Amino acid sequence: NLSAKVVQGSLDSLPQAVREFLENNAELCQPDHIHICDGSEEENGRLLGQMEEEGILRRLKKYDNCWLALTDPRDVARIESKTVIVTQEQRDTVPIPKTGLSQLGRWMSEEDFEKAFNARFPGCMKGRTMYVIPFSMGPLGSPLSKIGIELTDSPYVVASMRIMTRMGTPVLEALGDGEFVKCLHSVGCPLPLQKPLVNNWPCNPELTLIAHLPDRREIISFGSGYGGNSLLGKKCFALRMASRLAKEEGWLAEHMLVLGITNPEGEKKYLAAAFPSACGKTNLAMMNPSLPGWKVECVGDDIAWMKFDAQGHLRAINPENGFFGVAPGTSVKTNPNAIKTIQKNTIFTNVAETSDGGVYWEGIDEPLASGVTITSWKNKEWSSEDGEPCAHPNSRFCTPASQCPIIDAAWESPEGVPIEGIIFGGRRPAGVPLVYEALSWQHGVFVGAAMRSEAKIIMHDPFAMRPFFGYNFGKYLAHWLSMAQHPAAKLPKIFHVNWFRKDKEGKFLWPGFGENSRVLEWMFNRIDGSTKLTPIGYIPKEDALNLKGLGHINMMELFSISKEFWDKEVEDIEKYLVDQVNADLPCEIEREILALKQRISQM
Numbered sequence: 158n159l160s161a162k163v164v165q166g167s168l169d170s171l172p173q174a175v176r177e178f179l180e181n182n183a184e185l186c187q188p189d190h191i192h193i194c195d196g197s198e199e200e201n202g203r204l205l206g207q208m209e210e211e212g213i214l215r216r217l218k219k220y221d222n223c224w225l226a227l228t229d230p231r232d233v234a235r236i237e238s239k240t241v242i243v244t245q246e247q248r249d250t251v252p253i254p255k256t257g258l259s260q261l262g263r264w265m266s267e268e269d270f271e272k273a274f275n276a277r278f279p280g281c282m283k284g285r286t287m288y289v290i291p292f293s294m295g296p297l298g299s300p301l302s303k304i305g306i307e308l309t310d311s312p313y314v315v316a317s318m319r320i321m322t323r324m325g326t327p328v329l330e331a332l333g334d335g336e337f338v339k340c341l342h343s344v345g346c347p348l349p350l351q352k353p354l355v356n357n358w359p360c361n362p363e364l365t366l367i368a369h370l371p372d373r374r375e376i377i378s379f380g381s382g383y384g385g386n387s388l389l390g391k392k393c394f395a396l397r398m399a400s401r402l403a404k405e406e407g408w409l410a411e412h413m414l415v416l417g418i419t420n421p422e423g424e425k426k427y428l429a430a431a432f433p434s435a436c437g438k439t440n441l442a443m444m445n446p447s448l449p450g451w452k453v454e455c456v457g458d459d460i461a462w463m464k465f466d467a468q469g470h471l472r473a474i475n476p477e478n479g480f481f482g483v484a485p486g487t488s489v490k491t492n493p494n495a496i497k498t499i500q501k502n503t504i505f506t507n508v509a510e511t512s513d514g515g516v517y518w519e520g521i522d523e524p525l526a527s528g529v530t531i532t533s534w535k536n537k538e539w540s541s542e543d544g545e546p547c548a549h550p551n552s553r554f555c556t557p558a559s560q561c562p563i564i565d566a567a568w569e570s571p572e573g574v575p576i577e578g579i580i581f582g583g584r585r586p587a588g589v590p591l592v593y594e595a596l597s598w599q600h601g602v603f604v605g606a607a608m609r610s611e612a613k614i615i616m617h618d619p620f621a622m623r624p625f626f627g628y629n630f631g632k633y634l635a636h637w638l639s640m641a642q643h644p645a646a647k648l649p650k651i652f653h654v655n656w657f658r659k660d661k662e663g664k665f666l667w668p669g670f671g672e673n674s675r676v677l678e679w680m681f682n683r684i685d686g687s688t689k690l691t692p693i694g695y696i697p698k699e700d701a702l703n704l705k706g707l708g709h710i711n712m713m714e715l716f717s718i719s720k721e722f723w724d725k726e727v728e729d730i731e732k733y734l735v736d737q738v739n740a741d742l743p744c745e746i747e748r749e750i751l752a753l754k755q756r757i758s759q760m
């Protein structure tokens with residue numbers, strides 16, 4: 158029966174629980190075939206060809222084994238309005254706010270999700286193949302890694318997951334009879350197609366819904382083929398579901414890159430940073446530092462799982478296997494290590510294509526050769542003159558982590574790396590200095606809680622987890638606060654940075670990119686035990702920041718803290734936190750809000 162539809166692998170080699178999960182959903186989804194993925198090169202190569210024949214991907218002949226997917230323009234991004242978490246009680250998932258709808262999560266009742274589900278999945282894979290992706294989040298076979306099984310009817314998903322996770326037969330062997338996260342995904346276009354297909358990219362924007370059911374350990378996603386919505390081990394599992402597991406079992410799952418930096422005397426520290434949208438995350442994680450004798454190496458550019466070890470050090474591991482980076486704005490100048498990374502074995506999505514088979518995008522900063530022309534991400538001849546970008550602004554590259562020329566030697570050590578500093582941020586055109594340090598752990602938690610970033614709109618993105626909390630943010634804030642009562646904890650120092658402060662003409666006060674290494678240098682030396690006290694925390698004292706080799710920098714304006722800007726800031730932060738967090742806001746946070754007000758009132 159079922160075995161008759163299997164075109165690769167054997168039902169009988171799957172652990173029984175994996176087999177039951179597959180059986181239950183094949184019966185539900187009614188796919189024409191079952192493909193058990195093995196993770197092999199040969200399978201990958203096979204699936205690429207198949208994808209090329211069908212028009213899903215094009216070869217990028219300028220490079221070694223790169224491919225380009227173009228999507229339906231209705232499906233170009235993770236969509237938060239269609240993303241929900243499902244729990245018996247609303248409060249376990251989001252706080253009940255004082256006014257408005259919560260912006261800290263979107264809960265759906267189990268009754269509502271059951272109707273939503275039944276309206277979408279039965280028969281959804283008719284006419285297509287159901288692929289079975291065994292994948293590990295974390296180095297294969299570690300005790301501290303978690304495994305999932307994602308069923309999908311999208312080969313683009315398979316190939317992306319092979320890069321972004323460890324996938325294939327070795328994960329099934331490691332999993333044996335263990336537990337796993339059940340992940341079900343369908344693009345939602347059963348054949349025969351009921352609606353047109355744009356660029357050979359199936360999606361069902363109307364019914365798109367990305368659900369998480371933490372008590373069942375299930376992620377169920379329907380109707381988008383796009384990254385955050387389809388690659389379920391990354392945002393769905395490694396951030397949302399995990400942040401909730403972590404709150405239960407003593408650890409943290411966070412939206413942080415992790416880098417190791419070494420000073421000219423050979424001392425090395427690992428730092429973690431949580432930044433909101435469009436703040437240069439990959440750019441910092443794989444920075445080529447400008448300061449002589451300094452070295453930066455990349456552990457991860459997006460997510461980190463962290464847990465206190467036996468001596469109380471917070472150790473991080475990057476549960477991903479690759480980088481799903483925003484492409485526009487990537488160039489040799491801004492991120493030479495990212496460029497080198499994506500020179501081969503990479504999938505690109507919604508970027509532009511040169512006539513010689515290369516890629517292109519806003520900010521790539523690479524003159525075209527005489528006669529080379531550009532095809533945009535909508536498949537049309539393109540020119541600067543048309544008044545739309547040649548690449549979608551959320552376009553991506555999906556690339557093996559092992560290819561980063563500065564990948565850290567410890568990026569896959571199953572014991573993780575010891576975090577000595579955590580860095581929060583955002584895009585703040587006015588008011589917020591280049592760097593400041595927290596006064597205490599509780600104050601550091603409040604700094605993360607207070608994060609805002611200009612996306613002409615400025616929004617709150619606390620800890621850069623606003624779209625990703627797996628559970629009540631007030632409870633997450635308690636969970637972080639409680640780290641300070643962990644026996645012998647060695648708490649990382651907390652900082653906040655802003656690469657985007659502008660003068661009155663809107664020009665950047667700070668050059669950023671490699672020059673950010675000057676700011677990392679000061680944090681590094683602060684971790685080693687100097688400062689100038691201000692109401693918002695410590696900034697570097699006069700002349701402490703290393704400016705050698707830079708053109709002029711307006712230090713005074715860059716580090717300026719005005720009472721008036723900050724009177725409004727703290728009023729905004731208070732309003733936000735008391736309104737959105739309400740009955741769940743920890744008293745430690747309340748005290749930090751008041752204290753900042755008190756300090757600001759003293760200026």
Ligand SMILES: [Mn+2]
Pocket residue numbers: 412459
């Ligand atoms: Mn991210």
Ligand code: NA
Pocket residue numbers: 234235551
């Ligand atoms: Na997005």
